[PDB]
Design a protein around this ligand. Sequence first.
Ligand SMILES: CN[C@@H]1[C@@H](O)[C@@H](O[C@@H]2[C@@H](O)[C@H](O[C@H]3O[C@H](CN)CC[C@H]3NC(C)=O)[C@@H](N)C[C@H]2N)OC[C@]1(C)O
Ligand SMILES: CN[C@@H]1[C@@H](O)[C@@H](O[C@@H]2[C@@H](O)[C@H](O[C@H]3O[C@H](CN)CC[C@H]3NC(C)=O)[C@@H](N)C[C@H]2N)OC[C@]1(C)O
Lengths: 178, 189
Amino acid sequence: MGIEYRSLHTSQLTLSEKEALYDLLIEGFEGDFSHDDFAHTLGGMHVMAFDQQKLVGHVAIIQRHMALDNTPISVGYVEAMVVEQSYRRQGIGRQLMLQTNKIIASCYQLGLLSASDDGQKLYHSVGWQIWKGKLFELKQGSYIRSIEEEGGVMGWKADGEVDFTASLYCDFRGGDQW
Amino acid sequence: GLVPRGSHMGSMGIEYRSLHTSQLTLSEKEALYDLLIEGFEGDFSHDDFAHTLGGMHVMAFDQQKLVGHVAIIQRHMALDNTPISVGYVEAMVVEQSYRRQGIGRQLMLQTNKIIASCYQLGLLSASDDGQKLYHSVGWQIWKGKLFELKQGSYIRSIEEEGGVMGWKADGEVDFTASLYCDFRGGDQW
Ligand SMILES: CN[C@@H]1[C@@H](O)[C@@H](O[C@@H]2[C@@H](O)[C@H](O[C@H]3O[C@H](CN)CC[C@H]3NC(C)=O)[C@@H](N)C[C@H]2N)OC[C@]1(C)O
Ligand SMILES: CN[C@@H]1[C@@H](O)[C@@H](O[C@@H]2[C@@H](O)[C@H](O[C@H]3O[C@H](CN)CC[C@H]3NC(C)=O)[C@@H](N)C[C@H]2N)OC[C@]1(C)O
């Protein structure tokens, strides 16, 4: 412990934090990180962990506009969790998601994310549970169903009640829509 | 208790603060809502207040009084069939007694800064009485066709064409291409 946490919007980042963020994401994902993945990281809030001026952890929360069963839903979508390897064994990830949960709770109706191989445990340990409904994405104007993502997407409710069996229609982006 | 949030500058006795929605108190949320209705003379709907939150706010205060606001929403659209990241400008308003003092200009200058650092294109929907201010800081009429998701299908937004304005974020965007916005409650533009 001894890690200072900062919640800042992309518009508030230093050049130092951006350059440190980019190096951390590449080390953590090492070629699994597209230029599209980097694009999805930007535009919203970043939760960052610092060990005495040098960045050790990061998670981002971006606003997405989806449809939950023909009803508009304001989603805080979680992107690019990464913790430096030497710092992965200190609960930094859990602290990251708890600030994430607060931001989602004070801004959006629903938090969404697409779990990775390393972690479907950490997200579950702070209240995230697998999304059970069908998932759809925009593909050249019309909506295709994202079968390859169902079971990999998890949600988190904040002060409401959302049918985790309903269909979700995500907004359009580059690369992986989820 | 209360700590410094985001960022602050001052211009001619007016303090301007850029805050994310997650960085505002419930009291500040209600002060803003009070500002929006009085400033729009009742035209401001609850769907429009929902469209205001979730992103950044620039807020102008005459001393302790909230006298100006603008919001920058992140929206995910398509240009033709290319993905484009949009900072959508919402709920621009200055209190009636505080017009003619350069507050809307300063609000938009901060808006341009936020957009330039975060998104590829700024977009807004302006009134015919409001196009003059955004033109004064580089915004141009969008020339392409506009589309909106209605019940899962894209329909042409004929009534909004000519009323949407854009501001390129240090790049190149063809303002004659068509725009396919994201789904939301209330008015899509
Ligand atoms: C079906 N089995 C899965 C397999 O489809 C795949 O899932 C991918 C998921 O990981 C990825 O998002 C994660 O990777 C992005 C770029 N690499 C950065 C954000 C990161 N999540 C954030 C919260 O850290 C999604 N954008 C796309 C998913 N297809 O890889 C994991 C998997 C379990 O094998
Ligand atoms: C085609 N002639 C226009 C006419 O369609 C209409 O345009 C509307 C536009 O104004 C409105 O957005 C403005 O009002 C929102 C809620 N009222 C708050 C945000 C505010 N823009 C923010 C930046 O101040 C859009 N959301 C919907 C548009 N239909 O009214 C104006 C008009 C000139 O008559």
